Design a protein around this ligand. Structure first.
Ligand SMILES: Cc1cc2c(cc1C)N(C[C@H](O)[C@H](O)[C@H](O)COP(=O)(O)O)C1=NC(=O)NC(=O)[C@]1(OO)N2
Ligand SMILES: Cc1cc2c(cc1C)N(C[C@H](O)[C@H](O)[C@H](O)COP(=O)(O)O)C1=NC(=O)NC(=O)[C@]1(OO)N2
Ligand SMILES: Cc1cc2c(cc1C)N(C[C@H](O)[C@H](O)[C@H](O)COP(=O)(O)O)C1=NC(=O)NC(=O)[C@]1(OO)N2
Ligand SMILES: Cc1cc2c(cc1C)N(C[C@H](O)[C@H](O)[C@H](O)COP(=O)(O)O)C1=NC(=O)NC(=O)[C@]1(OO)N2
Lengths: 329, 329, 329, 329
């Protein structure tokens, strides 16, 4: 995956690339997501039957080809003319869920029409009733899950964007339109307004994970927002195992932040994740070769996950979740 | 804050800058203050009401705009012609306490007259009665607290200053005048001579913190003197949580050493500090733009603290003190 | 040993060298084998009788001159015209066992005829009966042990070899011929087909080690395959002490991965290993000076082991196994 | 102390300097002595009476000006024409014990005649009776202690000296003459032959320290021989606290390895050492300015120890031994 980031830097406007790659503050949490994953070592199992190694999972009542979904990333036409439609098509063809962003540069109904059963990421707005209508739009459009982003009461300070003066070009729009901090009351409002599973994205505290289950969430994403919100927030991968134990199967526990390979997916699943989100790498593939580049990234990731699982002695993702790990230096 | 240190290095005499930036010996403790803060990760809380995020604290019976005060730094006219008056004015306007140094290049009565209710840092002198008169002067002048510096029985060996031959220029004076090691007896002498809270600055041992409370101190500053006294002294941030537990609310527990951002203030408060002191960065802003530069530093710090608190789910500094942390590598 | 790797890089084709030196993926496990050994510190014992320091061990009923054997490395004619015969001769003369590889560039019967009682590494094939005939060939040829490689259900992804397009030259053959994942059933099939001790190579999980003893294995090699299989697999040296305790003498426990000196052998034995395997360094000596270069490597290693043991106060390898260690940074 | 090492490198023959500076093998233990000290942080005490800060200790019935002695270093005329007489004179004038080496380039009776009550380091020889006569010579000459070196059954492999071909020049002699591994029997032979305290140098195992007390030793030096014997031996400073607790005052516990400052002496004493040995820095001062250079090094070290103790709140070395420490990264 390191290959295509080189290709993405060359073709992208230098300040668009930094909007994609950057974190908040000193980017301590952005770097820590990677160091956290690199400290994790897997204890593989040997000599088990690998007749039918399968990377498939069931999540929110639907099968997925991989323990993975495309993370919500706003304004995907910043990276390629086809934007979200290109990514959604490749995700659909790969059997991987795709999270439609509230700030998508193509309307959510259009992305949903691509099929491949997508998810919708909600930013709490203005008034409750606009937010809830956005939820209803997503559900009417056949979205399968509401990914409620809970770690953005406001945008963290991106020192890359203040020093770049970066601003939305004229050709990139918030196609869903023509904000406010979310609370547990907002979560209950969404939950009461939809039959779709509500997935809280940006959970890092063990008791926030427990309360998420109590609040009726169908899932959480253990995430420090790719190091883009609180600078110095603990990496999600560092809280994952604790959160998995506290939740005790009460909801799906996803994780994101620095997933760069099938080996990283294996590490995440061995720490207990149901699935991972992948953000920045999907955008590199988009900016370097559009829908075909995304589809190839997903193919390579699919192959790496399958390879890592077999070398670890895991015929299923469930077996991968039962692997032990050891922390290194 | 890294921006202005560049600006301060350019305008300051190279040996004045090193007097400001340096530590003792190999500067192991100076570096360790920063590494200690960078190892601390905050576990943010989500979805809490942030209607009225306030960074204000009460300390020594008075409200402060931020959990922060300006640290005592001697001879501030070494950095800018207006010296302590410039810093005291900006601190007052920012709602932040200002510690008048015993070795101030402007008399303490003048700095106190600026208003904004200041603190006085005491170096134990010569004879008890000169030290106590200095205390009485500070109290007569309306100073709010005596910050008794307890970690300087004598100056640590600054290898930057011996190799520079650095000495006070002719235009910088100890305006309060026309020393000796402090003991617990000296502390009791001060305490008996003043109704002001006595704050012991330079406490690193848990039992020194307990004894400080027993001795009647109103506060302590957990501090290795910015790495300028004992080289190899533990960083204050590394002892803070232990000291907070041992004191059990018996006095205010401040910390200093390497605070460079609002995120660092959040980390300090999450470890249990009542407030932080900020030293070197305040002098950079002073040397780069005088009173206006200090005021802007305090404004930026105030904004960073507010941002960090909200992203961490803390509406008040008290909630920030209840945040959990996790140590990284 | 660092000297000759320089010599091996100069004379080897740059892509043959990388086939030898490389790991899978990001080579995180290849590097970790070395960092794991470098973190280990030995607590030497003083003032013990060193009259007859001996580095000899008994393993699989036979004496060996050193707690060491040559690791299975395929296609040794890739490194020198005499290939496996050169290494086998030097190993025999050094009193060190030599593991014949299933993919040897010289038939196993020829290598076995060199004498010095060798071992045979088995890759599970195609059909059970071809694999078992290969086992019978090895036993008929006087091989002393079947080293069943259990961590290669398939080859890990060598990013050095995909980026090199590396492929077997025309002059290098799989001389034993004219594959499939191994399971515990395959292990039982081998065990039932031979009176030779079966040694499972590639065990990293404590319960795989216990099951190996239960399955009738005569030994295991605690190994992540030199970092060439699962990228991110824990280093064998990091699991060695735990595995030794769990096995409780039930079988021989060997270790490999990054052994580069007699000091490393001492560390391995102090962690509890019966013996180590040495792979890449033996090939460097082969590519730099053929049989004479291998013999000199084994002589230097033999001297370093003897020196390290004496400085540690160990007259025998058994005493070296009772040494304590301490982990550093 | 870093200043004079620069001066020593310039004036010394490049291969003489490496004989002085080098360790065995990869020099992992040489480096680890320094990293071990740098990880140690002292928790200073405040506000204690420092009326009469004294760095003096009693050891082996005699007062010393500092918790320090000059370590045995062979062939001191390799570094300066006056050799051991220059160092012994400065040590005497500094009130610091001086260890006469068995391989001194000036006879032990001459060094002893300098006065300042010296120690004698014994290498076990040839036959018991030559070793015991060397002991008797030292005692007849007024030496105060026999420092029995127990970690050299033979010389560790100095890779700097094999690659230099370094050999004794014609002008440097083993003036005490005209070897064998030491055992606990050798220790008892010495102990029975002398009324002087026997000090075992090179103890790293806790049970070797306990046995040393049982064997009647008056002291031990916790030491990995400056990283020159077993490469990968644990640093002495890493075993010091454990060894101090196990010995429970039963003998003096000294430590050496990487002591480069008064702060390092403080760290050693806070970990429980009675005193430190200093080796390489004393030779740098000798090679850079002879007796006057050594005397100045001892003066600077004496000042640094006094400074560090006062900043740590210690009026005596005994108080310094009761300081707590904390390990860093
Ligand atoms: C450019 C960009 C935009 C967004 C995000 C991340 C990047 C880099 N993210 C974070 C991702 O969803 C993943 O959490 C993270 O990227 C995983 O890390 P990796 O890139 O290392 O795989 C968003 N999350 C939301 O919920 N809503 C959004 O609008 C979103 O933030 O405003 N837009
Ligand atoms: C130049 C200078 C002068 C002083 C101090 C620090 C510097 C850098 N300090 C230490 C500061 O008060 C903070 O403890 C430290 O600076 C926090 O670290 P940060 O700079 O990283 O924020 C002093 N403390 C006293 O009590 N009395 C003094 O006269 C004082 O020392 O002699 N003069
Ligand atoms: C080029 C090469 C080929 C093989 C192996 C290793 C290298 C480098 N290895 C791994 C070694 O046996 C050691 O485990 C490892 O090299 C120890 O690490 P060190 O080099 O640092 O000493 C093999 N193992 C098998 O069982 N069968 C094989 O065919 C084998 O793999 O396909 N061929
Ligand atoms: C050149 C040299 C020679 C000797 C020693 C050390 C050096 C560097 N040493 C080790 C020192 O006594 C200290 O243990 C070590 O130097 C402390 O470390 P520091 O240099 O960092 O302070 C010896 N020890 C003995 O017992 N007998 C000897 O003949 C001795 O070894 O053969 N000659």
């Amino acid at each position: 995956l390191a290959d295509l980031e080189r290709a993405a830097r060359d073709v992208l406007p230098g300040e668009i690339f930094d909007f994609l790659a950057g974190g908040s503050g000193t980017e301590a949490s952005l770097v820590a997501n990677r160091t956290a994953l690199e400290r994790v070592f897997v204890i593989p199992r040997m000599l088990r039957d690998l007749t039918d190694v399968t990377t498939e999972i069931d999540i929110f009542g639907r099968r997925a080809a991989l323990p993975m979904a495309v993370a919500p990333v706003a304004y995907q036409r910043l990276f390629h003319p086809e934007g979200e439609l290109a990514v959604a098509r490749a995700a659909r063809d790969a059997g991987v869920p795709y999270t439609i962003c509230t700030l998508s540069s193509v309307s959510l109904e259009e992305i949903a029409a691509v099929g491949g059963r997508p998810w919708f990421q909600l930013f709490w707005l203005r008034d409750e009733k606009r937010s809830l209508d956005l939820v209803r739009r997503a559900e009417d459009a056949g979205c399968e899950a509401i990914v409620f982003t809970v770690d953005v009461p406001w945008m963290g300070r991106r020192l890359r964007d203040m020093r770049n003066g970066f601003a939305l070009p004229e050709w990139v729009t918030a196609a869903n339109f023509d904000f406010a901090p979310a609370t547990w009351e907002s979560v209950e409002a969404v939950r009461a307004h939809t039959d779709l599973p509500v997935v809280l994205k940006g959970i890092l505290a063990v008791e926030d994970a427990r309360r998420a289950v109590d609040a009726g969430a169908g899932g959480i994403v253990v995430s420090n927002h790719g190091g883009r919100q609180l600078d110095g927030a603990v990496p999600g991968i560092e809280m994952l195992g604790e959160i998995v134990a506290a939740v005790s199967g009460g909801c799906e526990v996803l994780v994101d932040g620095g997933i760069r390979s099938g080996g990283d997916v294996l590490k995440a699943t061995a720490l207990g994740a149901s699935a991972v989100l992948v953000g920045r790498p999907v955008m590199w593939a988009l900016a370097a070769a559009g829908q075909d580049g995304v589809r190839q990234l997903l193919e390579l990731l699919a192959e790496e996950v399958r390879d890592a699982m077999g070398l670890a002695g895991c015929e299923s993702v469930g077996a991968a979740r039962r692997l032990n790990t050891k922390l290194g230096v």
